[PDB]
């Protein structure tokens, strides 16, 4: 029985714009050769979607969430399909309605927030993998009720600040709303009338649902998630906090939260647990300097399990 490893990997720098990155990108390519070599994944089933002005296939909003479409097609009951989603660029937090709501920012700001990447989840098949490696701001809680298995409510003298060279993968709620603004020619404070005015059907699930018919749909998932849990977040920061872009524009930036795992994956060569990929990357993390507090979000069962489910 052939089992599949399917990858989408997502950098978005935003090039030659006010909310300039430099090192997501980076961040993409050094995983796909991570996977390319030590986890067996193939050529023809990896996706990179990258913000580059030569790009053929940006990263945008509707590109992503149909490349994750593409790995939703193929992942079968029974299989054990590995399905890894690498995500370097901005990230964002909206109003829930008390409350708010984490998302990550592609390069046209049609934002995908934690109830997409629930809903995407909830269409995987018992035994299927989803790890999803998001190094932005506000990162936590981007898979929406899955697990907290690392984080401020299941753990427990201050490091120096860090001395590289470092920009928040974070945006604010206003610089977000203004850029759509700047799209529409509109000004409401309602983000969701921007996006669905701008996106229509490709718009977030948040923003196309009334809200009592989004709580009949969350319903049904809140049922299944009791049996079935598939979803596997390693997010760069907690909800409250930013992922630190490290470098600047001379090609050789890149994420602490990516460039952490790099390491942890350099110096441990056998297989490794969910659990403790994260916690080795918090203490890269932390010994440098780094004040952002990786998370990990999944079953009990699969924060045992290997990272890619390398043997």
Do not use: W
């Not at 390491?263 to 647990?273: I, P, Q, T």
């Amino acid at each position: 029985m052939v089992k599949k490893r399917l990858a989408v990997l997502v950098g978005c720098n935003y090039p030659n714009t006010r909310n300039e990155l430099h090192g997501c990108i980076n961040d993409v390519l050094a995983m796909k050769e991570t996977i390319l070599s030590r986890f067996g994944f193939k050529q023809d089933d990896i996706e990179v979607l990258t913000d580059e002005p030569e790009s053929k296939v940006k990263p945008t909003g509707a590109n992503i969430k149909a490349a994750l479409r593409r790995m939703v097609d193929k992942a079968q009951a029974g299989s054990g399909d590995i399905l890894f989603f690498h995500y370097s660029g901005h990230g964002t937090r909206i109003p829930s309605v008390f409350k708010q709501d984490e998302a990550i920012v592609p390069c046209d700001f049609n934002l995908i927030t934690d109830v997409d990447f629930r809903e995407l989840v909830n269409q995987l098949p018992k035994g299927t993998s989803f790890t999803m490696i998001s190094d932005s701001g506000h990162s936590g809680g981007l898979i929406d009720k899955e697990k907290e298995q690392i984080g401020p409510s299941s753990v427990s003298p201050a490091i120096e600040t860090t001395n590289k060279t470092i920009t928040s993968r974070a945006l604010p709620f206003k610089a977000v709303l203004d850029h759509l603004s700047s799209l529409t020619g509109i000004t409401t404070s309602d983000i969701g009338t921007h996006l669905l005015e701008l996106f229509g059907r490709d718009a977030g699930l948040k923003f196309r649902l009334p809200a009592m018919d989004l709580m009949d749909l969350l319903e049904t998932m809140t049922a299944r998630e009791k049996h079935v849990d598939s979803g596997i977040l390693m997010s760069g920061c907690q909800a409250d906090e930013t992922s630190a872009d490290v470098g600047v524009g001379n090609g050789k930036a890149y994420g602490a939260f990516s460039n952490a795992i790099q390491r942890v994956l350099n110096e441990n060569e056998g297989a490794m647990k969910n659990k403790q990929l994260v916690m080795m990357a918090r203490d890269v993390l932390e010994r440098l300097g780094f004040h952002q507090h990786p998370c990990l979000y999944c079953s009990d069962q699969n924060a045992d399990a290997t990272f890619l489910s390398q043997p």
